[PDB]
Amino acid sequence: SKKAKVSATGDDAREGLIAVVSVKVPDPKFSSQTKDKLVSSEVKSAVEQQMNELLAEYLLENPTDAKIVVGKIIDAARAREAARRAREMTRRKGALDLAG
Amino acid sequence: LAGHCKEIIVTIHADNSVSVQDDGRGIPTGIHPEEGVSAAEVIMTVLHAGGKFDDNSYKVSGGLHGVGVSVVNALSQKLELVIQREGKIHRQIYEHGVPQAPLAVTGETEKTGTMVRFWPSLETFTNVTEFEYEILAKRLRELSFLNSGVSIRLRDKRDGKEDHFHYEGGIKAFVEYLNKNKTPIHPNIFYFSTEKDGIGVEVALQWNDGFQENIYCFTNNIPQRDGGTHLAGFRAAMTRTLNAYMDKEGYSKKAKVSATGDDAREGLIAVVSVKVPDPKFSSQTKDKLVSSEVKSAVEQQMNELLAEYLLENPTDAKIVVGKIIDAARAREAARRAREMTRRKGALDLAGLPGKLADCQERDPALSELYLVEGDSAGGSAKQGRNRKNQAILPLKGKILNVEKARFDKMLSSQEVATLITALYNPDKLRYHSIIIMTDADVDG
Amino acid sequence: SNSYDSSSIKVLKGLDAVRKRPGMYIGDTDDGTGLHHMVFEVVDNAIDEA
Ligand SMILES: Nc1ncnc2c1ncn2[C@@H]1O[C@H](COP(=O)(O)OP(=O)(O)NP(=O)(O)O)[C@@H](O)[C@H]1O
């Protein structure tokens, strides 16, 4: 990031990712009968700490996978930054209507 | 909604409790002909028990399940219920849904109403033990906007701050209030109030120069967080009507705009409030309306009245169409800035036609490559070369420096590196032998 | 308007409460969400048994 000069937000690093989260809680907490959204924060914190441990271990134990994922993240971040920059610049100043 | 209650008072006490005082007809306190106890104890101790199961008492009402007040009573450590009706004051104390004493009469009065104060249980709610002022404030404000003439008072015994909201302008005034921190583009606000096929609809929308989409889905004075079928019909009607208007007026032909649904709703604040006799909600929170007849009715009404609005106001129509075209051109300019660079990451031009004139032999390390001025030299060079193992790549003027302006994206010709290798080089080693012919002048 | 009494409070015994308001119990009954949610709940009960 010292050379890339990017932000690497949440919606950018997760772009192009297919993840599956299967949690096991004894006493679930669903906000509806359809069970479409979990409201348990203890499961949230547990999954969070388990990720911060194991994903870190994975990224520090595999240099090739780590560098490929980071290259993809740099590509996506540069793409979104250039897109925002060009969009704003053109629309606010470079926009020229009435082609005649 | 029956036209009897005109004042509602919500008071936040210092002992972590909220009391709701209204002046309606009052909860029935008579003995239920089947349960054997007062109807208040029935609705507090029996699930799905109430008069909201038909149109005999409530012709139009948001409550349709009949378990809400039971949930409020059960999840509270203690609840006090005072009901005023027929000149009698009925009082009863609840604790965790268990009645402590039967509904007894404490006195007489001339007013009609009901007081509901409950102490929420801490064994169920975590990380939130105190009521937040801002959410209740927004709820009561928007409720007063959707209920003209209904006085709503909020009291807070913790800090003494009290408010009173009695707006009568409706959801139009609601949109005007929500546009206090924004900059609208059109003064005339789209607004109507119709009622077709037993279902009423009232929508007020207004475009602003912001970039946030906030369409408050309201159904019988109930907010929907997840929208519903009515929101889908709203969005589809808006999208199709705007597309038809931009097609028949020629804007989509002059600007070549696809005009997707997301660009049509860019920077739009809408308030859709519908009146349904018997709605259908997927949960008690009422976050989604699953009535498709309401969807169709709202869609038809929006298409009709929005086309009417766009064809009766030329200036506002022009401004709205210009903003939609601005948003769409922004989206497509971003698409350009993305995929043009994505293609520059790859090779698409390849500069093979035009100037490059290869030889008959295709095996590398046997042919030769040259680099001279195009029109001045390359003509005679090709007219005097061989057609067996000779290849010439013309040039145009000079070439930008590498150190003075280093940029991986800066490229003008790119033909040389693309034709000699793939740009990395050990794979393709075509033209192993290259010779650079150059004039004897100083520019050479 | 004025039709309010203890008889107005209606109590649905058995599964009448679910049939009267299927939305809070099954979801949407028109787009096909609830018809599939039937089998979804059945198979989820089977998996909970498993
Ligand atoms: N403030 C009130 N004024 C008059 N009657 C009330 C009031 N609160 C509750 N009742 C009665 O008690 C019954 C049960 O109330 P409630 O459980 O809130 O119904 P509900 O609105 O369908 N709950 P829900 O649909 O799940 O959000 C109602 O049908 C009414 O007959």
Residue numbers in the entry:
A (entry chain D): 303 to 402
B (entry chain B): 52 to 474, 483 to 503
C (entry chain D): 2 to 51
Manuscript text:
The type IIA DNA topoisomerases (Top2) are nanomachines that control DNA topology during multiple cellular processes such as replication, transcription and cell division. DNA gyrase plays a vital role in the compaction of the bacterial genome and is the sole type II topoisomerase able to introduce negative supercoils into DNA, a reaction coupled to ATP hydrolysis. DNA gyrase A and B subunits assemble into a A2B2 hetero-tetramer of approximatively 370 kDa forming three molecular interfaces called N-gate, DNA-gate and C-gate allowing DNA binding and strand passage. In this study, we reveal the complete molecular structure of the E. coli DNA gyrase bound to dsDNA and to the NBTI molecule gepotidacin using cryo-EM.
The overall DNA-bound DNA gyrase complex was solved at 6.6 Å using 94,633 particles. The estimation of the local resolution showed a broad spectrum from 5.0 Å on the DNA-binding/cleavage domain to 8.0 Å on the ATPase domains and β-pinwheels. The atomic models of E. coli GyrA and GyrB domains, solved by X-ray crystallography, were combined to build and refine the complete atomic structure of the full-length E. coli DNA gyrase holoenzyme in complex with the DNA duplex in the cryo-EM maps. The dimeric ATPase domain is sitting in an orthogonal orientation above the DNA-binding/cleavage domain (~95°) as previously observed with the T. thermophilus DNA gyrase12. The overall structure is asymmetric, with the ATPase domain slightly bent (~10°) towards one of the β-pinwheels bringing it closer to a distance of 27 Å. The ATPase domain is sitting 11 Å away from the DNA-binding/cleavage domain. Each β-pinwheel resides on the same side as its respective GyrB subunit, with an approximate ~45° angle from the center of the DNA-binding/cleavage domain. The spatial arrangement of the β-pinwheels induces an overall ~150° bending of the G-segment in the E. coli gyrase. The 130 bp DNA duplex is chirally wrapped around the β-pinwheel orienting the T-segment in the DNA-gate groove formed by the TOPRIM and tower domains to form a 60° angle positive crossover when T-segment path is extrapolated. The combination of the high bending angle of the G-segment (~150°) with the peculiar orientation of the β-pinwheels positions the T-segment to access the DNA-gate with an almost null or negative angle of ~−10°.
